[PDB]
Amino acid sequence: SWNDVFQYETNKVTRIQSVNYGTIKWILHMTVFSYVSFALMSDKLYQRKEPLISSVHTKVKGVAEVTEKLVHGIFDTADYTLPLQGNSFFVMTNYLKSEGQEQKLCPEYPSRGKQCHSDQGCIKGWMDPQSKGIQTGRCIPYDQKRKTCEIFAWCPAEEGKEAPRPALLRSAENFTVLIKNNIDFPGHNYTTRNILPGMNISCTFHKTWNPQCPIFRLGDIFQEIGENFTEVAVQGGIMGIEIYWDCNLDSWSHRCQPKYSFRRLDDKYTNESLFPGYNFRYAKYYKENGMEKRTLIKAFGVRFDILVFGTGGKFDIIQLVVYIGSTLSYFGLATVCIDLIINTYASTCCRSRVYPSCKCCEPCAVNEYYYRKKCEPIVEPKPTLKYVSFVDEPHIWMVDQQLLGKSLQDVKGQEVPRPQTDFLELSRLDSPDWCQCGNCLPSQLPENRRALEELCCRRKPGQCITTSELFSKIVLSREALQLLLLYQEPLLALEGEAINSKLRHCAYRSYATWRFVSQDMADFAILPSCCRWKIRKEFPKTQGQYSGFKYPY
Amino acid sequence: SWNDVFQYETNKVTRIQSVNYGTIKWILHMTVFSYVSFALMSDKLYQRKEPLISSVHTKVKGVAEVTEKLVHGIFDTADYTLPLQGNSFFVMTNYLKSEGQEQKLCPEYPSRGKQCHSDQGCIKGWMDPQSKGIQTGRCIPYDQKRKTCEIFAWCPAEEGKEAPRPALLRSAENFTVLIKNNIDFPGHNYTTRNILPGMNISCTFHKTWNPQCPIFRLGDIFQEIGENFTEVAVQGGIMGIEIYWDCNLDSWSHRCQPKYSFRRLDDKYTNESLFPGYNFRYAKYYKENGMEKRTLIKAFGVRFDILVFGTGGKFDIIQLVVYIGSTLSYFGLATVCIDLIINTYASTCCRSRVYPSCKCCEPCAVNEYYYRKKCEPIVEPKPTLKYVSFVDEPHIWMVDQQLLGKSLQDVKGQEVPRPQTDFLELSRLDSPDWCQCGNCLPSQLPENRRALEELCCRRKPGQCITTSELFSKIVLSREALQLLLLYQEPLLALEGEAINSKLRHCAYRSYATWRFVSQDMADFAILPSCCRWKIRKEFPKTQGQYSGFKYPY
Amino acid sequence: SWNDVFQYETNKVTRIQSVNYGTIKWILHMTVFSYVSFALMSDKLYQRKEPLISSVHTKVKGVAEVTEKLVHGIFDTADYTLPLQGNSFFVMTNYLKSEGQEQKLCPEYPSRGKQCHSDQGCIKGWMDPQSKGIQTGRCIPYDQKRKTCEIFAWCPAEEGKEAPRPALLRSAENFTVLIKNNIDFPGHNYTTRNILPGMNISCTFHKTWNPQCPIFRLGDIFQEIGENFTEVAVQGGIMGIEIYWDCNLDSWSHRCQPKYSFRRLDDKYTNESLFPGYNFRYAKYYKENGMEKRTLIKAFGVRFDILVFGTGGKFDIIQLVVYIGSTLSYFGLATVCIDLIINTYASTCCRSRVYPSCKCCEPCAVNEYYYRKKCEPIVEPKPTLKYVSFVDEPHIWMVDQQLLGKSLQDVKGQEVPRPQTDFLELSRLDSPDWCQCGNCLPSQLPENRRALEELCCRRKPGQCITTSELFSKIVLSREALQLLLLYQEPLLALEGEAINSKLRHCAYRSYATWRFVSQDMADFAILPSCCRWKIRKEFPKTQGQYSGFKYPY
Numbered sequence A, B, C: 001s002w003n004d005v006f007q008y009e010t011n012k013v014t015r016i017q018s019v020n021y022g023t024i025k026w027i028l029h030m031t032v033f034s035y036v037s038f039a040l041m042s043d044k045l046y047q048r049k050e051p052l053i054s055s056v057h058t059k060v061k062g063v064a065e066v067t068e069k070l071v072h073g074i075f076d077t078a079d080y081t082l083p084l085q086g087n088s089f090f091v092m093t094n095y096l097k098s099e100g101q102e103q104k105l106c107p108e109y110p111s112r113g114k115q116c117h118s119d120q121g122c123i124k125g126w127m128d129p130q131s132k133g134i135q136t137g138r139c140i141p142y143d144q145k146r147k148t149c150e151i152f153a154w155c156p157a158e159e160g161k162e163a164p165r166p167a168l169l170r171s172a173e174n175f176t177v178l179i180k181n182n183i184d185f186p187g188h189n190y191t192t193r194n195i196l197p198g199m200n201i202s203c204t205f206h207k208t209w210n211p212q213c214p215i216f217r218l219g220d221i222f223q224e225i226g227e228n229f230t231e232v233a234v235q236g237g238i239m240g241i242e243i244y245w246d247c248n249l250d251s252w253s254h255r256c257q258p259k260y261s262f263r264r265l266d267d268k269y270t271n272e273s274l275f276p277g278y279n280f281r282y283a284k285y286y287k288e289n290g291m292e293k294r295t296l297i298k299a300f301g302v303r304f305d306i307l308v309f310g311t312g313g314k315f316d317i318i319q320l321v322v323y324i325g326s327t328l329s330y331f332g333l334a335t336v337c338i339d340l341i342i343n344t345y346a347s348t349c350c351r352s353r354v355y356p357s358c359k360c361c362e363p364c365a366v367n368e369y370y371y372r373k374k375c376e377p378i379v380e381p382k383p384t385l386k387y388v389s390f391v392d393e394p395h396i397w398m399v400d401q402q403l404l405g406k407s408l409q410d411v412k413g414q415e416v417p418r419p420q421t422d423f424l425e426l427s428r429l430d431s432p433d434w435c436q437c438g439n440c441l442p443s444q445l446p447e448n449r450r451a452l453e454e455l456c457c458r459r460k461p462g463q464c465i466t467t468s469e470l471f472s473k474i475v476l477s478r479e480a481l482q483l484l485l486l487y488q489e490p491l492l493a494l495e496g497e498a499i500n501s502k503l504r505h506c507a508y509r510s511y512a513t514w515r516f517v518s519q520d521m522a523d524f525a526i527l528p529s530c531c532r533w534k535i536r537k538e539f540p541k542t543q544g545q546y547s548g549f550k551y552p553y
């Protein structure tokens, strides 16, 4: 039990002294190592990455003068900008005014060919989001030239009027926005900001000269991406200020700096029915003479959306371990490829065609030696398994099918090469129809099992193997068999029928080992009737019938 | 050195021709491959996934008429909606009005059983967030029926008044919001939007008919998730418009489309003390007659939060390599399982009980052959390691413990099977108390080391192995030992005491190899005293004392 | 073909009964298993993690009284807070007022040493964001003491005036904000909220006593992180309420609770030129006597940014499979380490120096046995490969280089150990200048190939190996060679020149196997001229020239 615990299994290997294969192995190992290292360091797969949480604080500075009796106006942050001071801020670039609005009946603004021509056309009680009123069903003259439906809404109405061109607040392109970005990686417990001590304040952002200046001129934002602020100012738009944080929190590779990029977020070619641009209608309410009045301003502008994103990486042992474990199996590529080469070039097909056709692959025949020193083929031992050898042939035949009452001599199997004998050890001092030697005899086994023993020493007519002197020296010589038995059992009693049986079995084994060198084939070999019966004649049984070949399993 | 570099180690293998094991191996390989492929393609583990950055632009369109002297009002986007046009927008569904507010003393609104009954109950200088004023400590009659505390706050007060039921702006359910969603994957450098050219504009969203229409009717939003807009309109709520982007950026599998889903974000059963619903109090300031007055509107509505989330996948070679490396080791499952089967069925326990009990597992005994052709057991060579063989027994005994002065014959070890001899090679032409053969002699070694040599040829009384003829043929025959020595050293000088010593050692080795076939056991074998001293008698030393067994290590 | 499919390859192994190595293997296996399990469960690597989508709803409650003719004011949520009720909300802590603003010429506010001293200093048409007006180029006296430039802007101007100290709305520290957080994991289809049924309402958040109370006192927020609300109230700031959701959605380990933490998001030491603190200028517009007037309020306060982040993990089989596959290769660590130990201690370097220097590593010499039972070295069979043995030496010499016309006897290779012979099997019954034995003869091969056969039996002068009796018994004995041939071919015809050739080849093989035990070396061995020519003399050819050694490949 404890001995079972205290065991270590190590694979048997074959140390090959080959320049080609060693060079290939080291080249592939180096390639795998290089790619693994490159992937680890480039993608920082050894680091735990966490997304950031951002806080944005914007301050827009800039004033515009608008001339529109002539009225001279001044526009500051309490005028053209909203209380928006975070991820988004709005800069007004144009506007439409409608002073003194009261909820009453009035003609809807004639625009986009909405002028009415017939009273029946207008509907009663119909909600009109385009005009923002309820039509009363009666057409009325908005102007002496054209007529429009009557809506109970805020009056006077100015819906559908185009934004003035050129934009009144074009000067917004000269306005400067300061962006303060605070990010944190709570898992990594790291916080930083885009404005650090020792940074100049009289700077404006540029891709090259001042890439870290958080002060942006809107016109520069637009022209860095090929957008015409003057055109966008008319109907408005949405622009994006991307702030990317590719941040490394490792001490030896610490750099957490923002990268500023810009992107228009509103489609230039939005259909006129999809409300192009960016605008919003905001109203100031007041009391006049005793009635509640409203002043409506339709403000066109650019909404700047500050989009902050990024990841913060810090070394994590678990991630590195996982990556290494993932990539470890790639170091078996050399083994796989070289074993594939050995297996393929060990095939008896290359010599036939490939080598004569291509003579450059001639020295690759050495892989047969490697294969035979690397692989030990074996077959499943099954009852039908049988091996036969014919002295007129230089190979052994394996039969792995049932004998359906037909002689094993006539049964056909497949050819296999007889194993090489141990030279170091060998260097020492009315006959049956199926019989082609004349010495074979009918089987005494039951009828259903006579086919197994119906085998001859040779396939073609000739002399029996029993005529060879080695048959008598090895198989029939009682002295040699006695020596073998004593070698196994030194104090054996060479008397009785037991010794005759043991000698018979040793003779069978001797023939099997002589003609089927491998013990694997010798165990499942089948002796010819001639040799079997000569053996039995030499070492015969008493008051018993021979059983024959047993299944080793 | 370079020869050390130019080496390739390949494992020795056993090619088994088994239908069952090959079928099992291929089945398991196919299963592993199928699961790995399924996981790779379903979860898109070959792709690098990046979260998106979103910009949302909303446009709500819809007008409501409210009747509340009778006052007829019109409510448009400058009235019921806020400047919110991004990720969130607010649609007012009800309201409470309080015109003409001045900062002075007044009775707090009697609500939720807040009516005061005693002057002492009211506190002086106490902040009252429920009433939003500082109590003066004196109770006053709010109405002829009930009394309330006096607060220096905006007056007249209307706190705690329930939202009117039914909701005044019920018609908000018919209002339509257009959502424009712009997403980007900056790492993958991909941008898209939810409105593409060629999409109809007179559409409203439906799960099946118009799943890609970014125009939503609020009532439809509510009824798609079993929410009653009429009820929510009273106190308000929060609704979520989820926009999911499961986007594949690979050219051959490119589809980046949004999936719209809805979710109520406010708890229906919020406790009345936790401010249920959604409302906000916004005030319009003005000057009246010389004093600064305020108009307060408590607006109840639905805040729609557009929640945009998703990931964009693009093929990455590094991710695929990592996944493949992770899954490569799963291809050894076939080897593990089949080797486990071989090891288990090679145990000498199955034959004893399992096979007779269950006869279906009879042909699985072939795994003993596979085990013995796959594993070569070996023991750690240690000084205490000793092997002994008794000619009255068919096994060898291994002793791996110290001899505490007691004879090795009486010491007990564990039984091991003597290895099979090479048949191919063999096929060729006052006695001591511990002695059970009569031919053994006392050891001449030092007293502490006599136990090692205190061993007999047999455990039970009988004839000595020295009486066998093979002992003289193999161990004592000077001709055979001389032939062996010459085989090792052809030009050996067969004269002197050196040749006698060499013959003695060869005789020891011959006995050890004969009775312990394996060289591993023969190296650590222990000769019996009888055989040892017969050998020494045949090849005796001169002017010296025999040392005995040395430790091969 | 199908037999090729029905094959299973299993590695040959060596079962070592070693306490040290088994203990090491199990220790390393346990260590790897423990670390893998720890990483899996601690980091929850078996779970699929999804980021959350959050909705935040805030309700600030609290009223302040400000005394500033003396004016007594009341400040409620319609006064000090914005319509912000989501991820951010603003609490006003101080303010500056400027009533009755009109767009006209006026002197800019003298602050930060901006007082003008010369008319020429002021510029005409110059935008002044600091003063928020267009300078007319003429200096005018703002006050009797100091003068400032003239700006066409809103007047009276109050830019650059410091926030009053102490802060007017200090009482904001006593105000309470209720945060309702709704999160969802749409991939995992899980939603939850920070307020659950059965939670008290009269609670305020504390780290220990009430960590789950979503009602926060602002002063407590500030003092939990060492911030002085009274100081921040003057100029304002930005504070962050982090809500972390480390949520496990597995039923057996379900806990999805928020963790509240606070963080100041505005730099305390922001440069005075970077607009420290948080403020915004919001204006109320009105009509007075017929002209449009403006009231400007510069509000200083704290903007609270609710930052919600977290991940939701649920068991995923794919992730667990990937992690296990990643970590499987780490279970080969025991094999790697033990094989490294075996390889290192099998080196013939330790015995020389390490063991005598350090005697504790003495019993580690057993690894040579393990190495020789684990590895079978083999060399690449190449035409230049040759083996030679000298009977005056105890080793075989391998030559793997071309013979540039110089005798192979004088060519130097590298020494290798002759393999141990099978004891079990052996236990059975004007001479050439390069010649150091006298029996060698010149080669009859072509001139370019005579060097191969120019080899002697010994390196130093002495007796030829042919004088040994084993040479005649093994190599020249016709009986033994005939027996070997018959063993290979039992019915061989021992007549003709074919038998002589076969005997010659068998004699070459016999010498090669005798002196180069391994068949690998015997195949590429080179016979000495003396032995070769004695053999040929014994078994000579007829009407033909001998070819010599062939390349087995």
Ligand SMILES: Nc1nc2c(ncn2[C@@H]2O[C@H](COP(=O)(O)OP(=O)(O)O)[C@@H](O)[C@H]2O)c(=O)[nH]1
Pocket: A501, A504, A505, A508, A512, A522, A523, A524, A525, A526, A527, A528, A532, A541, A544, A545, A546, A547, A548, A549, A550
């Ligand atoms: N390999 C092989 N073994 C055989 C053959 N015939 C008999 N044997 C072996 O010899 C034994 C049977 O001996 P047998 O002649 O029947 O003598 P008996 O059993 O005493 O009657 C079995 O254990 C077989 O393994 C044969 O043709 N081939």
Ligand SMILES: Nc1nc2c(ncn2[C@@H]2O[C@H](COP(=O)(O)OP(=O)(O)O)[C@@H](O)[C@H]2O)c(=O)[nH]1
Pocket: B501, B504, B505, B508, B512, B522, B523, B524, B525, B526, B527, B528, B532, B541, B544, B545, B546, B547, B548, B549, B550
């Ligand atoms: N395996 C084994 N070897 C032995 C035994 N006795 C002696 N030897 C070997 O024989 C050698 C010692 O020979 P020994 O009889 O002492 O002759 P001496 O050394 O010349 O006195 C050692 O190298 C041992 O390996 C034994 O019982 N078993």
Ligand SMILES: Nc1nc2c(ncn2[C@@H]2O[C@H](COP(=O)(O)OP(=O)(O)O)[C@@H](O)[C@H]2O)c(=O)[nH]1
Pocket: C501, C504, C505, C508, C512, C522, C523, C524, C525, C526, C527, C528, C532, C541, C544, C545, C546, C547, C548, C549, C550
């Ligand atoms: N290993 C080895 N084999 C040899 C040597 N000389 C001859 N042979 C073998 O003997 C065969 C050639 O026999 P050879 O003497 O030329 O007789 P021939 O071919 O009939 O003229 C070849 O197949 C060689 O493998 C030698 O020095 N070493």
Ligand code: NA
Pocket: A325, A326, A328, A329, B325, B326, B328, B329, C325, C326, C328, C329
């Ligand atoms: Na692996």
Ligand SMILES: [Zn+2]
Pocket: A434, A435, A436, A437, A438, A439, A440, A455, A456, A457, A458, A530
């Ligand atoms: Zn016959």
Ligand SMILES: [Zn+2]
Pocket: A437, A438, A439, A440, A456, A457, A458, A463, A464, A465, A466, A528, A530, A531
């Ligand atoms: Zn015959």
Ligand SMILES: [Zn+2]
Pocket: B434, B435, B436, B437, B438, B439, B440, B455, B456, B457, B458, B530
């Ligand atoms: Zn005895």
Ligand SMILES: [Zn+2]
Pocket: B437, B438, B439, B440, B456, B457, B458, B463, B464, B465, B466, B528, B530, B531
């Ligand atoms: Zn004895």
Ligand SMILES: [Zn+2]
Pocket: C434, C435, C436, C437, C438, C439, C440, C455, C456, C457, C458, C530
């Ligand atoms: Zn010579």
Ligand SMILES: [Zn+2]
Pocket: C437, C438, C439, C440, C456, C457, C458, C463, C464, C465, C466, C528, C530, C531
């Ligand atoms: Zn010689």
